[PDB]
């Protein structure tokens, strides 16, 4: 059964803003390494440490298939993505800090769109 059309549209717009968000000093798009995880074959240690692997490709797929039934459902997977990054990457690392910023972008953009 389909989500209300406005909900799908809000989810895509929020995710798009998170993905295209750029660092205001370097101009670097923070989401780049988060779009698609390396395969299990490429990075076996990741899938041993991370119980629920998720990337933005998977999140976009789940929007398209209406698996998220609310912005809270979407938020859970985005927060899971960032938490996974914070688990696999060391605190103080660029990717670690990027995942923190991506968290805050989601929260801010959701509020603006809401």
Swiss-Prot record:
Phosphoserine PTM sites in chain numbering: 1
Site (Required for binding to 'Lys-15'-acetylated histone 3): 88-89
Effect of residue 88 to A: Abolishes binding to 'Lys-15'-acetylated histone H3
Membrane-spanning intervals of the chain: none
Tissues with expression: Colocalizes with ZEB1 in E-cadherin-negative cells from established lines, and stroma of normal colon as well as in de-differentiated epithelial cells at the invasion front of colorectal carcinomas (at protein level).
Subcellular localization, as worded in the UniProt entry: Nucleus
Role, per record: ATPase involved in transcriptional activation and repression of select genes by chromatin remodeling (alteration of DNA-nucleosome topology). Component of SWI/SNF chromatin remodeling complexes that carry out key enzymatic activities, changing chromatin structure by altering DNA-histone contacts within a nucleosome in an ATP-dependent manner. Component of the CREST-BRG1 complex, a multiprotein complex that regulates promoter activation by orchestrating the calcium-dependent release of a repressor complex and the recruitment of an activator complex.
Record remark on domains: The KIKL motif recognizes and binds the NET domain of BRD3.
Record note on quaternary structure: Component of the multiprotein chromatin-remodeling complexes SWI/SNF: SWI/SNF-A (BAF), SWI/SNF-B (PBAF) and related complexes. The canonical complex contains a catalytic subunit (either SMARCA4/BRG1/BAF190A or SMARCA2/BRM/BAF190B) and at least SMARCE1, ACTL6A/BAF53, SMARCC1/BAF155, SMARCC2/BAF170, and SMARCB1/SNF5/BAF47. Other subunits specific to each of the complexes may also be present permitting several possible developmental- and tissue-specific combinations.
Similarity comment text for this entry: Belongs to the SNF2/RAD54 helicase family.
Name of the protein this chain belongs to: SWI/SNF-related matrix-associated actin-dependent regulator of chromatin subfamily A member 4
Residues of the full protein shown: 1452 to 1565 of 1647
């Amino acid at each position: 059964s389909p989500n209300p059309p406005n909900l799908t549209k809000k989810m895509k717009k929020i995710v798009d803003a998170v993905i295209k968000y750029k660092d205001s000093s370097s101009g670097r798009q923070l989401s780049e390494v988060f779009i698609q995880l390396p395969s299990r074959k490429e990075l076996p240690e990741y899938y041993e440490l991370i119980r629920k692997p998720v990337d933005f490709k998977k999140i976009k797929e789940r929007i398209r298939n209406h698996k998220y039934r609310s912005l809270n459902d979407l938020e859970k997977d985005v927060m899971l993505l960032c938490q996974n990054a914070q688990t696999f990457n060391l605190e103080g690392s660029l990717i670690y800090e990027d995942s923190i910023v991506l968290q805050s972008v989601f929260t801010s953009v959701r509020q603006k769109i809401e």
